[PDB]
């Protein structure tokens, strides 16, 4: 058995972390007071859910999680929420002043005076681990804390916990819900300073989650609660292999082995189906062939891009529910001849299929409906480089005039770090070009 | 969290008292300081401006400063007069005589330490002080000379806090003395160096709105201040109510100040009151970007928008404000710089101002603001070319070198705005 | 606070001070024995009228004034007049021999024997002030005491009170009621000496006031009693900003910043309207527009000059009575087009307006009709230099022959003091020429 | 402030006695000294010429002086002889014999110490002394010689005070002796140096007014003195009544004396009619006042130019009429006023008129035409000095001959100085 520690940084990481841990309890039958009636080994055990939950002497199941934010307003939501008794007061770390959407403020100024406290609370959970395998870090790209402080945490985690895996759940910046104009800068900065301290990163564009909530779920103006409940469904089905018995992606090393052939290209695209509204009383039931076909529709991807004009390097189909393997490869046979699937020539054109018989769970009162089968598609395609191209262009427009740079320089960062980070993205954008594009 | 408010001079104290009486009515605070509102959103961020006195009493974190006891006793005698702390009234008896030199170097020097003692006493009792906000005029003596002296002194002790001011520009249409361009040019020289955010409230624009739009043939200072309080209430809504666009002063400065010296904001309000017909969201957005609603006498079509913060108050559909704002950006796409993507941000608050069902407040950092400083510079040069009225300032120890240095800094600011009005991408 | 001490020097200063203080008491409701029944604060207070009146424990309101003359006969009229109980005996200082129309005797021979006594009484009044604003000095230019002693007093006041403001209410000489042939001498001498010791001086041309009383009031031969009752109305309008309060009341020092662009150019031109008799004021209502138009008529100014031949540098309208700002703005815009008001290019072309609401009052038995509204215009125009030219020409005619100069030399003055004063007058005429010239 | 009045010699005491009669009648003072008047204006400035003794007895501040006791025993016998202070009489016995040197150098020198003691006595009782006025003649010996001696002595003890004189020019038409031109020249030389104001009362002009105008074939000293009394009552009105124009002797000197040596005034009086003629207007007074017939000095003002002029009107009249008529006569006679002294004509109006007149007008002019008076005296002087006539009268008292030429050369300069400014122009 090998334990995983989750770290939630910034407002986006905390609020998404709140939605995920609520979902984990609903799936495993864990009550808000930490009790788990279905668990027969009181105060210990080596079950699959023990990779994410630790048990006290009183049978209380505690999430192996750490919440960090430089302002206490977002953490107080967890401290007085529905699952307030689930966490210990030491798992929640609040600052007094946030990073003001400034990467330099969260990395150099506020991060310097809080990095040792966060690592101390992390080491206290690691000492409770018999075989810690790695960490999962939840953070945003545009926030000052989510980008600035996260970058420093991964740099330190590589030192204190070498040889351990580190997985990212990132929030790509979208203007419909953005709160700062400097998010493009902060995004490029954290990406360059973490590229060598992350083994796999699941990027979620708020633009895609926003439109999925509007089209598929009939929310006129989606809020963070709507976005986070949909995002936690994707995070749940990605981490379900760690929390349930199985053979595909049983440990964090297998994620990088199955999905990451080249280390710098560790941004796999996620596609989820079906997304049905609860108010839809009429309840059609899509076959495995229908939901697998929807995994190749751009409208269901976590990042809006066109995989038809890219190349695949790895592909993982994660089914959840009433799914038999006979129906899966039958759909893969039909999808071969109906879609534009082009793998790189140094990889096998194939699919790694994982089936979990337990169907997905929906939060009572949410916007998502109960389904009998669902698919989460993790594919490493070069088409995701479009997100890097859009981000680099917005960076180039602002940095050409040195706009807003004085906020970063006045915080201790030197201007040379900007072009150093931009040069890394130019190299990353060309790494995708060499793997995918031909003559 | 906490913000310390300072009002200095006649204009600063008169608009400052109007600001406290308006926002106290919005947060359910009566003249005695008791809570009497129905919504819990009124006390969520009540501590950003009010200190909680023992007994469910809310005293404002305000400091009243002047060089003469005139306006001081007038504020204490009006409504919401007893809500202010009595120990935060700091006044002299000599006055400034509409002289910037008297307010900054001669008469204000004797009282500047008494003011700093109250500033420290209020800042020491702050859990998480963000910075300071100041209301004053630039054409007078106290709020102009001593106001910029207080900013320099406070920045010395709190260098990492945010310095924010509501500065009122002088205009010949509403003029007290002839030396107003002298005091204004000297004050802005200080404002470009020692403040982080400055709201430019042009008395010229206030007059034209009262005269040409509100149809008041002879506008009074009470008519102008009614527009100032409505604008001051709108630009501080994101600081007083729950939200996450520009919830604090620093996050506001990071979003609105792309270059350090260009931190002079042009405010706009809609609708212009002094009505039973209900306004619509497309009409609020249409009037928000119109020059007829700008609080500074500038034509936005004459320049380009660097950053824009629009905020809607009332009960409306977030989808409609998204549609209308994205539609007004397409109508005026030529007036937004292309090198700053997504430079217009929108917030929506549920609590509207008193007497209005829906309102809209515009906060823009436009290069067209250079028309304001160019106007002051032309009036400054016409007099300074002949050294007219300069003996009122040299008699207080000032030098002509200080005037030419303040004028050159103004002209540099104007040409800096012009540099980005033509810069493309 | 902001107390003002009034000094009345010589016969003209004393007799004008008598008219002013009688009018002040009527405006505030102060009886000839110093009692003010409307005043509820006994023994003191910080009311508006307290800038000019102190209070005793007995409820008496005493003027903050000093009357000084080198001869007793003129002040003896105040000691036995209607308002004799108003002043303390220490406020009225008299000598035994006047200056005999000689600047030299006023500033040197006779004045030096009484100057210390006068400053001691001024110090006693200044000590009773919580925030002394400045001095108002009433005097004539042609008298021996009004010119010589006033110069000595202004010089001593600058030594004892630094740069504390000092305002002058001076009487420009006129041959109609002139008492000496050497008045151009004393006028040039006292103007040169007090020039750098005075922050603002309001000249009153005796010939202008004499002519106003003839045309507008139908007095066939005006006397000092007629002239002083009109002069005190101008003084009342100017100081009404300090003695009263109100929302539209603008302090006079706020006008002083607008009126004096350069230290030596501190001679505003005054104009009062309406000056009408009761026989003509009957069946005759005078609107705000009519009295504002009369301010720009050259035959209504306190000093004989033509403002159309000069340029304006400042224009202040001081209304008192039933006047609203809507009427003022309408009248100013009308005059802006129907009149040719040329401003210098180095200052805005605006009109500073102050409105008092206390209507003008008249002394019982006076020549002025009681009106509901009045206006006093203070303007700084280069046209006032004509008064300097006429006065300097009479000086040059006599000094070329050294006529009457032996009366000044015999008292201790040198001929160099005459040419030094005349040279300063010539520089002042050039100064008024230079300010009117447009910019390069 | 007070004025100390001094009268010396026969003529000085005759015209000095008549002076105290008119002003006492004007101020309501009886020969005993009590105030019998009925107007407060008579006592407002009563102390200028009178002392207030116990019992409301007004005593004149007069000092009667002569070298012979004859003429002073008669002024004690005539009217107003009791009102004078008895110890203020200073009379000698030898007499002067119409000799200037006898009064100035020899006999009058032994008596000048007794006169000075009475002067200091009256000066000690003064709150603020103005100066001294002297009535005397220039033709005799005591008033001419000793009169000038009193001026120099008093000036040494009161140098900053005003010295005024009523000097009577001699005339061969009423001449007492023949040596009169010698006494006038020697005394005018003194009056040029030691006096501030001098009213030139010409006996010639006085004789012509009585003979040609008033029609008196045989004019006596009483007829000449009545014109003098009306003059000195006129030129002192501004000093005796609450005016403000030339209220004292120093303010009059500043207005009338533009150059220190030119301080000899010619006076005029209007109306001048006899008891055989029979509606006098303000324009008529103004015209007669600037006529050569009404001048109390034999000088035609149209033969010179007015440096300064003082006009005094007395009686109930329109003040507007005076201002317009005074301005009228100045425009119509613009050539006879020097243009380099602007506004050189001052006018005062007194409410009360003199005794026996409804309205009167007194003239005080400083005209360069006064040189005609000095030219006449100088011509009679040089007619005798060429022949060395009667020099033993003066050299017999130890006098020198060049002292006569000094007094002449001076007078010649006085005439030249008056001519120098008559020809001066402003351009
Ligand atoms: N999906 C999602 N995005 C969020 C959420 N909260 C914030 N974001 C996005 O994250 C970005 C801002 O980062 P935040 O997490 O607010 O910033 P932070 O880490 O708190 O940083 P500072 O407040 O500057 O210290 C914007 O693009 C927001 O739209 C959330 O709950 N869900
Ligand atoms: N308006 C006005 N002018 C006056 C008055 N009294 C005198 N004058 C003028 O002032 C000048 C004379 O000055 P005065 O004030 O009389 O003289 P003084 O200051 O007493 O000087 P001396 O008496 O010479 O010591 C002349 O031009 C007069 O016309 C008065 O009451 N009113
Ligand atoms: N909008 C507005 N402007 C004012 C007000 N009072 C004064 N002003 C302006 O401020 C300037 C004068 O400054 P003021 O505040 O009176 O001077 P201080 O008291 O010395 O600071 C002029 O431009 C006035 O028009 C007011 O209440 N409202
Ligand atoms: N007008 C006038 N002249 C007189 C009178 N008495 C003498 N004179 C003249 O004065 C001159 C003689 O002076 P006098 O009186 O003898 O002087 P004394 O020597 O001092 O006594 C002659 O010219 C006389 O005509 C008089 O009463 N009136
Ligand atoms: Ca267990
Ligand atoms: Ca009182
Ligand atoms: Mg945050
Ligand atoms: Mg003001
Ligand atoms: Mg006097």
Author numbering:
A (entry chain A): 1 to 439
B (entry chain B): 2 to 42, 45 to 277, 282 to 360, 369 to 440
C (entry chain C): 1 to 440
D (entry chain D): 2 to 42, 45 to 281, 285 to 360, 369 to 441
Show sentences the authors wrote.
Here, we describe a multi-reservoir, high viscosity extruder as a step towards automation of sample delivery at XFELs. After commissioning the device with lysozyme crystals, we collected time-resolved data using crystals of a membrane-bound, light-driven sodium pump. Static data were also collected from the soluble protein tubulin that was soaked with a series of small molecule drugs. In two commissioning beamtimes at the SwissFEL Alvra endstation, we validated the general performance of the multi-reservoir extruder and determined 13 structures overall.
